[PDB]
Write a protein that binds this DNA or RNA. Structure first.
Ligand SMILES: [Mg+2]
Ligand SMILES: [Mg+2]
Ligand SMILES: [Mg+2]
Ligand SMILES: [Mg+2]
Ligand SMILES: [Mg+2]
Ligand SMILES: [Mg+2]
Ligand SMILES: [Mg+2]
Ligand SMILES: [Mg+2]
Ligand SMILES: [Mg+2]
Ligand SMILES: [Mg+2]
Ligand SMILES: [Mg+2]
Ligand SMILES: [Mg+2]
Ligand SMILES: [Mg+2]
Ligand SMILES: [Mg+2]
Ligand SMILES: [Mg+2]
Ligand SMILES: [Mg+2]
Ligand SMILES: [Mg+2]
Ligand SMILES: [Mg+2]
Ligand SMILES: [Mg+2]
Ligand SMILES: [Mg+2]
Ligand SMILES: [Mg+2]
Ligand SMILES: [Mg+2]
Ligand SMILES: [Zn+2]
Lengths: 305, 115, 217, 152, 108
RNA sequence: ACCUCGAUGUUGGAUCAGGACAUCCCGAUGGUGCAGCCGCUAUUAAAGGUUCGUUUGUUCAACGAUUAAAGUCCUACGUGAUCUGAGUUCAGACCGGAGUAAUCCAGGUCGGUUUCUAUCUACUUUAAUUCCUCCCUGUACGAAAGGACAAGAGAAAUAAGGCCUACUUCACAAAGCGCCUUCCCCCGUAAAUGAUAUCAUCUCAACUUAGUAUUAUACCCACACCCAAGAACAGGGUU
RNA sequence: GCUACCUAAGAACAGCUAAAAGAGCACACCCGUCUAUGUAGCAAAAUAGUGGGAAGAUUUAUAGGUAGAGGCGACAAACCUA
């Protein structure tokens, strides 16, 4: 009857033991998936035009400057891929959509704070539960076996990407801040009207049109930034340096996928089509991959000859 | 950032800009879609009760890093054709204006010091 | 020992990994270009590459009146009057187009922010462009210049007399009346120096950063 | 919007908040156990820990003496802070205060809490204790632990 | 603005008996093993806390009697000793608060 | 003089604007007394936009500077239970005038109380445009004067949506004055082949193109404490 | 017993500048210019700021007087128990 939590009936001796045991199990499960190509990997088809591969779920670390060889600064955000794994695959027919769907999970969380069904699903999959699961529409060419890990090197410098995230929630905000209404003057007689909305509608209709801009909750909704350049990849820490700003707060989980803009339709020719596989070990990628125009740290000071 | 009604210091050898007058020269119009004038933007000027076109060569508002931030809103008088009214500009002039070489080649040539 | 201000992060919820990465980049750039030790009040000369400047290089000499920012984006602002025109330039330490930063005169002013030099007399911002760099002893505490600048008429960019600014390098006696000083004291907020939950202790952070720097070296 | 704001808005302003916390903390230093509204106790716990640290710093430290003089409105407690509490916690590095919720105030049904300095002479609080190691679940987990240890 | 019509008892009952209005049953109540009175799991037991508070009040009244006036807080640790109890070596050098009753079993 | 005088508050402005197209600008198109540049006129097009100031209560008007343009209207001459009351025939008063006077003048002028705690309805998170610079090019065109398209490259401005690495207000954060991203059509006509009417005819003939929408894709998809989540509730984390 | 005016006999007016002042700055005190709030309000006319006077034609306590076809009025058709 009464609600319970995992620590309610655990003794002083058993609490630390349970913590250590579960953390060890989680890390062991995470390590067990570090060799996907050696565990019955699904067929790896070559890239073809019209193919859409899977994306990642990264974590917004912060922002920093980044200067290009022309002496131009660019604000670049840091997106860290933290325990990103493919979890579920549904085919065209199964999902009934025009494209197949891959579920991708990120930011492993505690098993003690998840629903029983989710725990069962993750136990069957063999991975610890993830904070967020997002669905990526793909072609059947890009299907990946569930449980495979994804890395920041899945993207490459010079690529253009789309990042979706829940915007910073600003709560119930007034009309001036929410919709940028001019408001009323501060002086010259204005009585108790400085930030209120003006006329909300006209007299004739005798109602308020649906969709009228009114005070209400702002933020905390999913928004997408399109066509952000990937300036750099840090393979050691699995970090993507995405041009410009991204929705959401720091340490927020952002869904990252190849840009949908028409200008960038078929630039996935040279990118790892299904996904980057470190287990392949064709050539161990450098610690940092830079776009051609980036002023790499450790490089000579740029002189405009 | 020079807007309308801004009192602006005419840094130029021009007698029109240097002559005393009971009113300080004020920006009348900023030749830009938004009424905010940064370095290199043209403006109108009610100077000595006369409408004269001038060029912004420095302002108090901070700009992008690595660019000077002058203590006074400096402006150079220019003719409609673009030729500078004066013959010498003593104060430092931001080097970014040389990006507009050709557009203000004569003004840049008149300029003495750059910062 | 001197740890550059940019390395010490402002407190927040951002993950330490971001700071580690940014510090790695900063240390790589410091290996490339030597960023000297300097304080707000020291005279610096920055030689920077500029596409439009004659000779493609530009040297600016001025007094550092404010160091701000943290990480790779840290900046310092140099001020100086040039043919009687006060110019301030906000240089970025890790901008790849700064050829050299030379501490012409290493000194520390009474205040950590000399933004009031704008309202001070021009003589306190004037510095010879071609002044030779004074040499400081290898092992010697950085000199503290106790110069108190005289101000110009009361209309100022900011209310420097207000306690919140906590300015010590202004001769307020020669500028403001006792009545004005008493009126300004209404914003004292004495509790602000004693409320212990606002102080930001950075001993452990500085120790870790120093360990990172030593490892990089 | 109050993202990242860590200080509650209490009293008639910032100064009044500081003074309320100061009175509560002076009472805490004097009596070693104070019951007060939950939010105020939560706000004052950090300041209590900070005073313990300042007392650890020592009598001779002028900064610590000034902090104690400000925060302890009753000057007889400064010798206490420097000679009874700090020596008591010299071994410890933190967690000098124990805060526990109390049944709501009878008057206005306010969320109340009791905050005490650990190791005080006063009678111990009815601290919440975890389930005994001899329970069914705990014994099963002990069996798990023993099996794992035997395996390794 | 004033009501345009009286709201009926049906509408009023809907509003004031909507489960959002109704009091929520609390399932965090539990029996205190010490005294057996009811307590919320996170909250301290009222009965036990009152016991401790009354004993603390007695001890504090003795402390005040020994101090004899304001601003006379001791500069040494304090130990509470009950009838039939003598100071230990640790208790030596500590202010002794004597209580005229047997030591409570819960107190140690 | 049909509802409203046991009250439907009524000029101008602020705020927010919904709608029409009889289109001011941007799009396409026919004609021209269309050489080019400007234009004029007509068809189609309401997705988007349609400036800031001086005097004046002005809506407007004039003027100044711009703009691609600074559209005409309807919405209780939209919107005072959102705001302002400068004008405006309430109470005071002066001037000119009328009257014997009280007092008055669609004359001027100085002043003059802007209520409402929301019961109901309704509503409260639903692929962007434009300008300019260079070049084309001093080319096409033109006697000269002058002076283009299209294509290409680059820059911006605004609008929408986000963000805090810098700068700035400022400081565990919120902001802009800062930065970042912004992606498809629309139809008027111009033509092929071809009958009725063996020519011809772009076709409310069958038909072939410019001619595309059926938008496409994108997004979302499972006790207790703290929180970048939040009025409450809800939501995220607690390994 | 408010208010208009008056009668009797009282009281108050810091400080500074000036000098025997219906003088100036400025408290107390009197008033109520302008703004905001309030508008079933704290108030059936208030609050906060701001402001005019503040040794006088001032303010003000006490008692008395003028009564409605009237009184009183530095005329605002003012005031004469909201
Ligand atoms: Mg405003
Ligand atoms: Mg009002
Ligand atoms: Mg107001
Ligand atoms: Mg004139
Ligand atoms: Mg200023
Ligand atoms: Mg309060
Ligand atoms: Mg009728
Ligand atoms: Mg009739
Ligand atoms: Mg009626
Ligand atoms: Mg039409
Ligand atoms: Mg009409
Ligand atoms: Mg009026
Ligand atoms: Mg008359
Ligand atoms: Mg009037
Ligand atoms: Mg008036
Ligand atoms: Mg109103
Ligand atoms: Mg309302
Ligand atoms: Mg034929
Ligand atoms: Mg006097
Ligand atoms: Mg007088
Ligand atoms: Mg009269
Ligand atoms: Mg009259
Ligand atoms: Zn109990």
């Amino acid at each position: 009857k009464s609600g319970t939590w995992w620590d309610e009936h655990l003794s002083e001796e058993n609490v630390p033991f349970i913590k250590q045991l579960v953390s060890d199990e989680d890390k062991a499960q995470l390590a067990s998936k570090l060799c996907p190509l050696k565990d019955e990997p699904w067929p790896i088809h070559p890239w073809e035009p019209g193919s859409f591969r899977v994306g990642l779920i990264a974590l917004k670390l912060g922002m920093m400057p980044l200067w290009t060889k022309d002496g131009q600064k660019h604000v670049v955000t840091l997106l860290q891929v933290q325990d990103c794994h493919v979890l579920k695959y549904t085919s065209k027919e199964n999902c009934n959509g025009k494209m197949a769907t891959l579920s991708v999970g990120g930011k492993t969380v505690s098993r003690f704070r998840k629903a029983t069904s989710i725990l069962e699903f993750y136990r069957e999959l063999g991975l610890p539960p993830k904070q967020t699961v997002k669905i990526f529409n793909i072609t059947d060419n890009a299907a990946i076996k569930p449980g495979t890990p994804l890395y920041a090197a899945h993207f490459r410098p010079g690529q253009y990407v789309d990042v979706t995230a829940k915007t910073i929630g600003k709560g119930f905000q007034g009309v001036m801040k929410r919709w940028g209404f001019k408001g009323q003057p501060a002086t010259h007689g204005q009585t108790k009207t400085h930030r209120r909305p003006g006329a909300v509608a006209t007299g004739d209709i005798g109602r308020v049109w649906p969709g009228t801009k009114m005070p209400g909750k702002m933020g905390n909704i999913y928004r997408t930034e399109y066509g952000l350049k990937v300036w750099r990849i840090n393979t050691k820490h699995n970090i993507i340096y995405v041009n410009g700003s991204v929705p959401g707060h720091k340490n927020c989980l952002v869904k990252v996928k190849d840009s949908k803009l028409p200008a960038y339709k078929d630039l996935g020719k040279n990118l790892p089509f299904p996904t980057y596989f470190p287990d392949g070990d064709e050539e161990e990628l450098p610690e940092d991959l830079y776009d051609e125009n980036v002023c790499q740290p450790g490089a000579p000071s740029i002189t405009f000859a | 950032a020079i807007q309308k009604m801004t009192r602006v210091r005419v840094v130029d050898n021009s007698a029109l800009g240097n002559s005393p007058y009971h009113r300080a020269p004020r920006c009348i119009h900023v030749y830009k879609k938004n009424g905010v004038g940064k370095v290199g933007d043209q403006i109108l000027l009610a100077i000595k009760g006369q409408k004269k076109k001038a060029l912004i060569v420095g302002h108090c508002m901070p700009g992008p890093r690595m660019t000077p931030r002058f203590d006074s809103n400096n402006v150079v008088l220019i003719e409609d054709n673009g030729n500078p009214v004066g013959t010498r500009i003593k104060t430092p002039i931001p080097t970014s204006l040389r990006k507009r070489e050709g557009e203000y080649s004569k003004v840049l040539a008149i300029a003495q010091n750059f910062v | 020992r001197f740890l550059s201000p940019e390395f010490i992060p402002r407190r927040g919820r951002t993950d330490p990994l971001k700071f580690q990465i940014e510090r790695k980049d900063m240390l790589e750039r410091r290996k490339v270009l030597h960023i000297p030790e300097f304080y707000v009040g020291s005279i610096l000369r920055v030689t920077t590459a500029d596409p439009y400047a004659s000779g493609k290089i530009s040297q600016f000499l001025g007094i550092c009146i404010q160091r701000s920012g943290r990480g790779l984006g840290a900046t310092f602002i140099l001020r100086n009057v040039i043919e009687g025109q006060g110019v301030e330039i906000c240089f970025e330490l890790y901008n790849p187009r700064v050829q050299e930063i030379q501490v012409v005169k290493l000194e520390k002013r009474l205040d950590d922010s000399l933004l009031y030099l704008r309202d001070a007399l021009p003589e306190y911002s004037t510095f010879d462009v071609n002044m030779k760099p004074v040499v400081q002893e290898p092992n010697q505490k950085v000199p503290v210049n106790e110069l108190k600048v005289k101000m110009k008429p009361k209309p100022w960019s900011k209310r420097w007399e207000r306690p919140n600014f906590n300015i010590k390098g202004i001769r307020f006696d020669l500028c403001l009346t006792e009545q004005q000083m008493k009126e300004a004291q209404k914003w004292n907020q004495p509790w602000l120096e004693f409320d212990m939950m606002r102080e930001y202790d950075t001993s452990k952070i500085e120790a870790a950063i120093w360990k990172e720097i030593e490892a990089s070296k | 919007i109050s993202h990242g704001r860590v200080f509650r808005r209490m009293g008639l302003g910032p100064e009044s908040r500081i003074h309320l916390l100061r009175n509560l903390l002076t009472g805490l230093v004097r009596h070693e156990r104070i019951e007060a509204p939950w939010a105020r106790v939560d706000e004052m716990r950090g300041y209590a820990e900070k005073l313990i640290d300042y007392g650890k710093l020592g009598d001779t430290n002028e900064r610590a003496m000034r902090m104690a003089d400000f925060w302890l409105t009753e000057k007889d407690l400064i010798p206490k802070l420097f000679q009874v509490l700090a020596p008591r916690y010299k071994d410890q590095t933190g967690g000098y205060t124990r805060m526990l919720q109390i049944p709501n105030r009878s008057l206005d049904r306010a969320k109340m809490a009791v905050i005490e300095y650990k190791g005080n002479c006063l009678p111990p609080l009815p601290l919440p204790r975890r389930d005994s190691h001899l329970t069914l679940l705990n014994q099963l987990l002990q069996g798990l632990r023993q099996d794992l240890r035997q395996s390794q | 603005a004033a009501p345009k019509n009286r709201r009926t008892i049906e509408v009023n009952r809907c509003r004031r008996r909507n489960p959002q209005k109704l009091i929520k049953v609390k399932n965090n109540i539990d029996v205190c093993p010490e005294c057996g009175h009811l307590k919320q799991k996170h909250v301290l037991c009222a009965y036990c806390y009152e016991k401790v508070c009354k004993e603390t009040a007695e001890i504090r009244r003795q402390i005040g009697k020994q101090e004899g006036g304001p601003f006379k807080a001791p500069t040494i640790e304090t130990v509470v000793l009950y009838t039939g109890e003598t100071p230990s070596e640790q208790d030596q050098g500590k202010r002794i608060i004597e209580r005229d009753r047997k030591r409570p079993s819960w107190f140690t």
